[PDB]
Amino acid sequence: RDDFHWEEYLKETGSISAPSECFRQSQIPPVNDFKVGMKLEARDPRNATSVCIATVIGITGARLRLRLDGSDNRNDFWRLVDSPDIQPVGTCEKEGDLLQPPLGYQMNTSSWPMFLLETLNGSEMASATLFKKEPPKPPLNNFKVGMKLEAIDKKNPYLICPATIGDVKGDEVHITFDGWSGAFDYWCKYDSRDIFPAGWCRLTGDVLQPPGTS
Ligand SMILES: CNCCCC[C@H](N)C(=O)O
Incomplete structure (x- = not known):
């Protein structure tokens, strides 16, 4: 209002x-310099042990509306730019882990390896600088x-x-x-x-x- x-x-x-x-x-x-369409890694809100690729669907204040790549558009979630639940692409690997498909992945599991490459190809991956402390x-x-x-x-x-x-x-x-x-x-x-x-x-x-x- x-x-x-x-x-x-x-x-x-x-x-x-x-x-x-x-x-x-x-x-x-914290300052929010993310842009719609950027790619990042986020912990699956419906499966905490999983880190998945997420796309910025929208921006609001210091928050990001996110959607996990490969899933439907009915489980979007919101995270602060300084939330521990999001991180730049590549982080997962460095913390001894592998990116997983989202709980709502709409394709067959075997398609994950190629989908990951395809969804990140020529995409705009948010820089480490955008993630605040x-x-x-x-x-x-x-x-x-x-x-x-x-x-x-x-x-x-x-x-x-x-x-x-x-x-x-x-x-x-x-x-x-x-x-x-x-x-x-x-x-x-x-x-x-x-x-x-x-x-x-x-x-x-x-x-x-x-x-x-x-
Ligand atoms: C405390 N915020 C509650 C919002 C409820 C919104 C919902 N569409 C409803 O009208 O029930």
Whole structure:
């Protein structure tokens, strides 16, 4: 929403936003120089032990909409340019591993070797320079109940929404989405890369969803 401005929203709701130091997100957001069509390696979101070739389908703020080469277009996922889950082509090999076909590979398994060559042939492989350094983990869990922040809706990952810490337990926090039912609530580690300080979308040029209408 064009009207949503944190300073005003905080005033209105009589709330405070979690300080930037609570998050495992860089004080100065990483720069996103990726381009649509670039190739990179990404851990298969539906098969963690696999590293696959991914193509940048879209760009949004400091995030990349990715699709695993050879799979359908219904399992796209979003990753920060400083996410540990993505890396330049060639990394997998250097960490003693082999690239695998995606879980949703649409061709026969035996076709993988030639498909890999074909999909990378004359393609634009994102340079190591585009991959940013992950922020260090905040030493402690400094989140307090009631603090507001921006969080990814894990049921609809493209969405970053105004959220509130509903609970704190050990190194985890209970995320609740403002204006929506508990149907989208979830627990995550306080250093999750899926939560961000108020103002993140504004600084990175990403899309912050407007609060819901509860
Ligand atoms: C907390 N964000 C929730 C978004 C829900 C969007 C979905 N299309 C629906 O209307 O259910």
